[PDB]
Design a protein around this ligand. Structure first.
Ligand SMILES: Nc1ncnc2c1ncn2[C@@H]1O[C@H](COP(=O)(O)OP(=O)(O)OP(=O)(O)O)[C@@H](O)[C@H]1O
Ligand SMILES: Nc1ncnc2c1ncn2[C@@H]1O[C@H](COP(=O)(O)OP(=O)(O)OP(=O)(O)O)[C@@H](O)[C@H]1O
Ligand SMILES: Nc1ncnc2c1ncn2[C@@H]1O[C@H](COP(=O)(O)OP(=O)(O)OP(=O)(O)O)[C@@H](O)[C@H]1O
Ligand SMILES: Nc1ncnc2c1ncn2[C@@H]1O[C@H](COP(=O)(O)OP(=O)(O)OP(=O)(O)O)[C@@H](O)[C@H]1O
Ligand SMILES: Nc1ncnc2c1ncn2[C@@H]1O[C@H](COP(=O)(O)OP(=O)(O)OP(=O)(O)O)[C@@H](O)[C@H]1O
Ligand code: MOO
Ligand code: MOO
Ligand SMILES: [Mg+2]
Ligand SMILES: [Mg+2]
Ligand SMILES: [Mg+2]
Ligand SMILES: [Mg+2]
Ligand SMILES: [Mg+2]
Ligand SMILES: [Mg+2]
Ligand SMILES: [Mg+2]
Lengths: 267, 272, 267, 272, 272, 55
C-alpha cells in the first residue's frame, strides 16, 4: 500500500491528513532496542560532587557489563545562574538554551574524565556512536542532555525559561533510537505530591500516568511537564522511571526492570 | 555532607517547573535583538520549478537588497518527500528523517546564493545564523540560510512526519530575533479553505486575512506547518505573517513594505 | 638511489620527467591491503527501499565476519533532480558536486541507522578509521561515496554534469588505501552492450578490459567512463567487479573472489 | 514490487553517462558567479625566499586592494618537496602526499595574511571560499587562501606525485567562479623552452605567448602543472592566463590591468 | 645511510634551544599586526552583577564603536568558581578545569554580544580571532570573544587553579597583535594593597600607578592573574595597562583615550 | 470637500497626477512606535490613496 503513500507525498502537503494516516501505517524500526538511557541530574547529583558521583561511576562501570548505557547529564545551578542573568536582560529562550547546553557539556566532560580509564567516552552524536555500544568492554557512552534547539527553541506560553531541557533531551533520544528503558537519576526516591525539600508533608508516588499527573495540578514536579506531553505522544517508550542515585543499588535494580522509585506511564 | 553546592542566584534551588517562582525573574516580555531584520521564507515548491521561477525571484531580491536587511531562508520541497517515502519504507522514525529534509533545504539555499553571489550574498550554516548573524549582515545586505530547524535527531514524536519544518523554523528565528517581519513565499496566491491544486479545488476560497486560531481549529490541509500555528500562539513580537505568491512579480517587494497582497495571519500577540 | 631523488625534488620542478621517473621507482605501501570496497548504488538500490536494502544489510552483517568492508553510498535521483535544477540555471559542475555530495551523505545516514545495532558506523574518515576496521565485531564502515572535489571538480569536455562521482570516489578510495578488491552493487547482473532498461536486445558482458570497453563505443555505461581512465592508470587495483545486489548471495560470493557479474580489467 | 522510486525530473532514469540525454539539459555554457573577481596565485618558491621577496610583494598588494577585489591563493614550495621525499621513502601513495603539501600552501597563506592583516586581509579556508566568499569580499577587499585544490586522498593515480597542485586549483576556482582573470606569480620572468635555472639554461628561450596545447603536446619541465593544461582545454570562461615574475615590482600590478609583462597562455575558449 | 633529510634554512640542524644560534634570525623585535586595535577585557564579576551593570556598560560600548575598533573579551566570574569547587572535590587536575571555565567566559561573551547585536556585534570563537580578526573588524566595528586562552588541557602545573585566565589571554593577544592598548574592566576602582572587599579592607590603599615587578615581587591577592605579571615582563609592544571600574560610567571611555582613571601598570617594555 | 487640513491642498492636486506613490500615511510622532510601524506599512494613522492604479 506504499503506492498511495508515494503518490500522496509528491502531491499533497504534509498537513494532508490522508497522508499522515498513511504514514502512521508505516513500519517501525528500533535503532538501539537493547540500549538504556539514563539522565544524571546536575543540580541533583553532580553538583553534590564526590560523594554522589564516585558511587554512581562504580555502579555504571558495573552495569555496563550487562546493559548498554547512554548517559545524559544535566546542567545544574550554573545554568540557573545564567538563566537569571539573561532573563534580567530580557533575553529570549533560545539564548538561554544556547547557554545551558554548555553547562551540560561541562558536566559531561567532568564525568567522562572519570570514566576514560574504564573505556567510556564522551560523544557528540550519542545515537550513532555505534562502536562503543557494540562492544562489551565499553558498552556505554556519555553525552550532554541538552537538545540542539539552541535558538529555535519553542518558547513557553509565559516567560523565557526554556521548557525543553536535559530531561527532554534524553527522553527524545530514547524514543528516537527505540530504546527499551528510560531512567532519571535524581536526589529523591521519586515523585511526590510536592517538593519535599520545601514541604515535608509531601506524599510519595510509586506509579502514576500522565493524565493523573496533570489532574493533580502539580505546581512543581521532578520532571519537565512538556516531557509528559511528549511521553503521551511517543511510540516506543511508553514509560519512564525516576530513582534516587544517592541510594546505592537503586540504579542497578532499575536497569534490571525492578520497580525502585516512581514509574510514569503514558497510559 | 553530600549537600548541593549552589551558585547564589534568584533561580537557585529551583526546578524551573514552578511558574510562581520563575515569573518574578523570567516572566517578563523579552527584547528584540535584530529588530531591523526582515525574514523571507522561500518555499521549496518554488525552487523546484527551476529557472522559470527563480530568475524572476532572483531579480526581485537583487532589487530588494538596498532596501532591506534580509535573511532568506529556503525550504525543502519535493526531494524531502522522496526521502520520506524511502525512510518510511524502511520504517525510520521522524527524528531520522528531519535532517534528511533539512539538507534539501540547505541545498536549495546554496543554489539561491550561487545565483546571488555577484551581489554579495552567501549561505551561512545555522551556527553562524545563531551566534553571528549581525556581523554577516553588517558586511553585506542579505544572507541565505535553511529554514528547517535543527531538531534533527530530537524531533517531536506523535507523527511519522516531522512537524517542525521550514515555516516553523523561520518563525522561531524571527520571533527570537524580534525581527521586523516574516514573509512567506509560496506557489499560490495564499491560503484557501482547501487545496486548490487538489480534488476540492472548486470549493477552495481565498482567505485574505485570518488568525492562527481559526486555522489551528480547522482540520484541512495548509501550505504551512500546523506547528507554526502552535508556536504563533506563544509568540512575543511578531504580530502578523503574510503568505504571498512568488511566481507573481512584485508581490514579495510589496509584502516587505506591508502591503496586503496575499494572506495575513495574525498571531496571539496583542499590539500596544 | 634516494639521494638523486632528493637532490632533484629540491631543485627541479615536479614536471621534470627525470623526477617523475625517479619517483615511480619508489616503494609501494598498502594501507588497508586486506580491505574490500563496495559501492551501493542509490538510484539502483537504495531508492528502491526496503526490499533491496534489508537483504543487503543482512548480507553485510554476515560478510563483515570474514571480510573487511568499506561501504560507499551513491546519491540517487534526488541528485539528478538537483542537477537538472542547477543546470537550468547555468550553474557549473562544482556546485552540482557540492549538491550531490549532500545527497550521498544522506543515503549513508539512512544506511548507518540500519547498521548501528550491528556495530557498523558512519564515517567521513573511511580509511584512517583504524579503530572499526580492526575489530572483528565491527570490521566494516559506511561512508559517503562522493569525492571532496566539492567545487574544484574537473569539468567535462561539454556540459556541467560532474564526471567524477560516487563511482569514482569509491574506486579512488580503494586505489589509495591499496584495498584488494572493488565491487559495484547495482540493479543489473553486470555490464551489457546497452542499457537493458531501454533496449531489451542488449547483450551481457561477463568480462572485458578498458580498451575493449572504449572500442565498443558505448553510448551509456553502468560506470562513469572517467573511472576507466583512472583504472587504466592505477597501481594497486587493476580490476573491478559489478554485480546485482537484488540477487541474494552475489556479494558473499564476489567477496570470496567468485565471478558473479561483470569484471573490468585495466589490462 | 522493488521498483525504483523516482523524483520526476529531466534527468530521471538516467545514468548521466549518455551525453545525448544530458545535453538537452546540461549541454549549455554556464554562468559567472563572481565575474568581478581577480585571482592571483603566488608561487611557493617566491614565499620561500622570505622577506626579500615578500615585503615588496606585500606593498604591491597593499596598493592593489582599492583597485581590485582579490583572491590571493598561495602555493607550497619546497617544504612540499621534503614531505614528498619522506613519503616516498616510506612508499606512501600520492593521495597521502597531496594534503601534506596543501598544508604547506596554507601555512604560506597564513603568513602572507599576517603580513596584510593591517589592511583587512585574512586567510579564509577552503570551505569558506567555496560558499561564503562573496560576503567575505563584500566586507574587505582581498582574501588569502590555499591554491591547492582538496583532492587529498582522492588524488588521481598514475604518478607518485600529485598532479593537481596549486596552479590547477587556482584555475579551477577562477573558471568556476567565472572570474575576470587569473594571474600567476613566479620566480622567473615567465615560461621558457627549458628550465633557465637548470642544465640547459643557455638554450632556454623566453615564450611571450603560447597556447595550452602547444605546451601540453610538448615535453619537458614547466613552472606550472601539466594538469593545468588539461583543465584549460575544458575551460568555459577564462581565455588567457598570464605568468609573471613577482621579484620584479610593478609586473603584477600591470598584469592585473591586462598588460603583457610575462607569458600569456591562451586556453581552449573561443570568445565572441 | 639513515641521515636526516634537511630543508635548507638558517635554522636547519638546530634544536632552537641554543640562543646564540637563533638570535641572528629570531632575536629581533617583532611587528604589530593590528596596531589599530583596542582590547577590552570585561571581568566576570561585572557580568555576574547582571543588568544593573551590563546595561550601562552596553550603552557605553554602543557609543565607543564609532570611535574605536574593539575586541571585547569577557571573563568567567563565579560559575568558574563553582566548577572549580566541584572538580576539586572530584580531584580533577587543573588542565581539566581550565576549559570548563573558559566556557563560562564564552557564555558571558555570547550574552554581551546578544545585547549588542543590534549594532553589528557578534561573538567570534578563538580560531576566528586568531587568523580572521581583521576581516571581521573590516565588516563591523567591534567583536566579542573569550579571554581565557586555549591552554585547556595543556595548562601549566604547580597549582590546582589554572594560572592562565582571562587577563593573561587578553594580554597575550594584545601583545601578539601589537594592539594599541589593553584595558581591563573590574568591579573596583583599580588595584589596592589588599582586597577592599576582604577583612583587611581598612588597610587597603589605592595604587594609581605601579609596575608589574613591584606587584609580582609582592604577596597577596590581586584582581588580576599573577601570570599576567610574568608575561608582562616578556612583552614586546604593550607598555601600560589600565585597570578601571566599569560600574562607574565614563571611565572606560576615558581609558580608551589614555586617561588615568584607574590603575596603571607599566610593563617591562622600554619605549623610544 | 472644504475645511482645514493638516496637509496642503496642492498636495491633493498633485496626488491626482501621481505616477508611483499609491498611498500616504499620516501619523502622530508624539506617540512612539507609530513612525516605525508606518515605515513597515502598518495602519497606525490615516491612509490617503492617490489616483494611482496598481497592477
Ligand atoms: N513533585 C515533586 N516530587 C519530587 N521532587 C520534586 C517535586 N517537585 C520538585 N522536586 C524537586 O526537584 C528537584 C529536581 O529538579 P532539578 O531540575 O532541580 O534537578 P535535575 O533536573 O536533576 O537537574 P537538572 O535540571 O540540572 O537536570 C529535586 O531535588 C526535587 O526535590
Ligand atoms: N489550504 C491550502 N491553501 C493553499 N494551498 C494549499 C492548501 N492546502 C494545501 N496546499 C498546497 O500545499 C502546497 C505547498 O506544500 P508545502 O507547504 O509542503 O510546500 P512548500 O512550503 O512550498 O515547501 P516547504 O514545505 O519545503 O517550504 C501548495 O502548492 C498548495 O497547493
Ligand atoms: N551498458 C550498460 N550495462 C548495464 N547497465 C547499464 C548500461 N548502460 C546503462 N545502464 C544502466 O545504468 C544504471 C546504473 O547507473 P546509475 O548511476 O543510474 O545507478 P548508480 O550509479 O548505481 O546510482 P548512483 O549513480 O546514484 O550511484 C543501471 O540501472 C543500468 O540499467
Ligand atoms: N620551462 C620552464 N620555464 C620556466 N621555468 C621553469 C621551466 N621549467 C622549470 N622551471 C622552474 O620551475 C620552478 C618552479 O617550480 P614550481 O612551479 O614547482 O614552483 P612554484 O610553482 O613557484 O611553487 P608551487 O608549485 O608550490 O606553486 C621555477 O623556479 C623555474 O626555475
Ligand atoms: N589587591 C586587590 N586590589 C583590588 N581588588 C582585589 C585585590 N585583591 C582581590 N581583589 C578582589 O578580586 C576580585 C576580582 O577577582 P577576579 O579578578 O577573579 O574577578 P574578575 O577578574 O572580575 O573575573 P575573571 O577573573 O573571570 O575575569 C575583585 O572583586 C576584588 O574585590
Ligand atoms: O538544570 Mo536544567 O537540566 O536546564 O533544567
Ligand atoms: O547518482 Mo551519482 O551522482 O552518479 O552517484
Ligand atoms: Mg531539571
Ligand atoms: Mg508551504
Ligand atoms: Mg551512477
Ligand atoms: Mg609554478
Ligand atoms: Mg626539538
Ligand atoms: Mg580580575
Ligand atoms: Mg501639516
Amino acid at each position: 500500500s506504499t503506492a498511495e503513500l508515494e503518490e500522496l507525498l509528491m502531491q499533497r502537503s504534509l498537513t494532508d491528513p490522508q497522508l499522515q494516516a498513511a504514514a502512521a501505517a508505516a513500519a517501525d524500526f528500533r535503532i538501539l532496542p537493547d540500549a538504556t538511557v539514563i539522565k544524571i541530574g546536575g543540580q541533583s547529583v553532580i553538583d553534590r560532587g564526590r560523594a554522589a558521583v564516585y558511587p554512581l561511576v562504580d555502579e555504571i562501570v558495573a552495569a555496563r557489563k550487562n546493559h548498554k548505557l547512554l548517559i545524559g547529564t544535566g546542567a545544574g545551578t550554573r545554568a540557573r545562574h545564567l538563566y537569571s542573568i539573561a532573563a534580567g536582560l530580557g533575553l529570549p529562550a533560545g539564548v538561554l538554551a544556547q547557554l545551558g547546553s554548555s553547562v551540560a557539556d561541562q558536566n559531561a566532560a567532568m564525568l567522562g574524565q572519570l570514566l576514560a580509564k574504564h573505556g567510556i567516552p564522551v560523544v557528540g552524536g550519542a545515537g550513532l556512536s555505534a562502536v562503543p555500544l557494540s562492544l562489551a568492554e565499553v558498552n556505554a557512552v556519555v553525552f550532554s542532555g541538552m537538545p540542539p534547539y539552541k535558538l529555535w527553541m519553542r518558547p513557553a506560553a509565559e516567560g523565557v525559561i526554556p521548557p525543553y531541557r536535559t530531561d527532554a533531551g534524553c527522553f527524545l533520544l530514547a524514543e528516537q533510537f527505540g530504546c527499551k528503558q528510560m531512567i532519571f537519576v535524581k536526589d529523591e526516591d521519586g515523585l511526590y505530591t510536592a517538593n519535599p525539600k520545601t514541604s515535608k508533608d509531601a506524599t510519595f508516588i510509586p506509579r502514576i500516568s500522565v493524565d493523573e499527573m496533570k489532574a493533580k495540578g502539580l505546581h512543581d514536579s521532578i520532571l519537565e511537564f512538556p516531557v509528559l506531553d511528549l511521553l503521551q505522544s511517543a511510540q516506543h517508550v511508553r514509560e519512564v522511571q525516576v530513582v534516587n542515585g544517592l541510594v546505592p543499588g537503586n540504579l542497578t535494580r532499575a536497569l534490571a526492570g525492578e520497580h525502585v522509585g516512581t514509574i510514569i506511564t503514558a497510559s | 555532607t553530600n549537600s548541593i553546592k549552589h551558585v547564589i542566584s534568584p533561580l537557585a534551588r529551583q526546578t524551573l517547573q514552578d511558574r510562581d517562582l520563575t515569573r518574578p525573574v523570567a516572566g517578563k516580555r523579552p527584547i528584540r535583538l535584530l529588530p531591523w531584520l526582515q525574514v523571507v521564507k522561500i518555499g521549496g515548491r518554488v525552487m523546484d520549478r527551476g529557472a522559470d521561477a527563480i530568475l524572476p525571484l532572483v531579480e526581485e531580491l537583487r532589487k530588494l537588497l538596498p532596501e532591506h536587511r534580509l535573511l532568506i531562508l529556503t525550504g525543502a520541497g519535493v526531494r524531502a518527500r522522496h526521502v520520506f517515502s524511502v525512510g518510511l519504507d524502511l520504517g525510520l522514525p521522524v527524528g531520522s528523517l528531519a535532517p534528511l529534509a533539512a539538507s534539501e533545504a540547505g541545498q536549495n539555499g546554496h543554489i539561491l546564493a550561487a545565483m546571488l553571489a555577484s551581489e554579495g550574498v552567501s549561505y551561512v550554516e545555522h551556527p553562524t545564523v545563531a551566534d553571528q548573524l549581525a556581523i554577516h549582515l553588517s558586511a553585506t545586505r542579505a544572507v541565505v540560510g535553511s529554514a528547517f530547524p535543527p531538531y534533527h535527531h530530537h524531533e517531536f514524536p506523535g507523527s511519522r512526519i516531522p512537524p517542525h519544518r521550514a515555516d516553523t523554523g523561520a518563525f522561531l528565528l524571527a520571533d527570537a530575533f524580534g525581527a521586523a517581519g516574516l514573509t512567506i513565499v509560496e506557489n499560490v496566491d495564499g491560503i484557501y479553505t482547501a487545496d486548490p491544486n487538489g480534488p476540492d479545488r472548486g470549493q477552495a476560497r481565498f482567505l485574505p486575512e485570518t488568525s492562527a486560531t481559526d486555522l489551528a481549529k480547522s482540520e484541512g490541509p495548509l501550505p504551512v506547518d500546523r506547528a507554526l500555528l502552535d508556536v504563533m500562539a506563544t509568540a512575543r513580537h511578531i504580530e502578523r505573517v503574510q503568505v504571498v505568491n512568488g511566481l507573481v512579480p512584485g508581490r514579495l517587494t510589496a509584502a516587505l513594505r506591508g502591503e496586503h497582497v496575499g494572506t495575513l495571519i495574525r498571531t496571539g500577540v496583542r499590539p500596544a
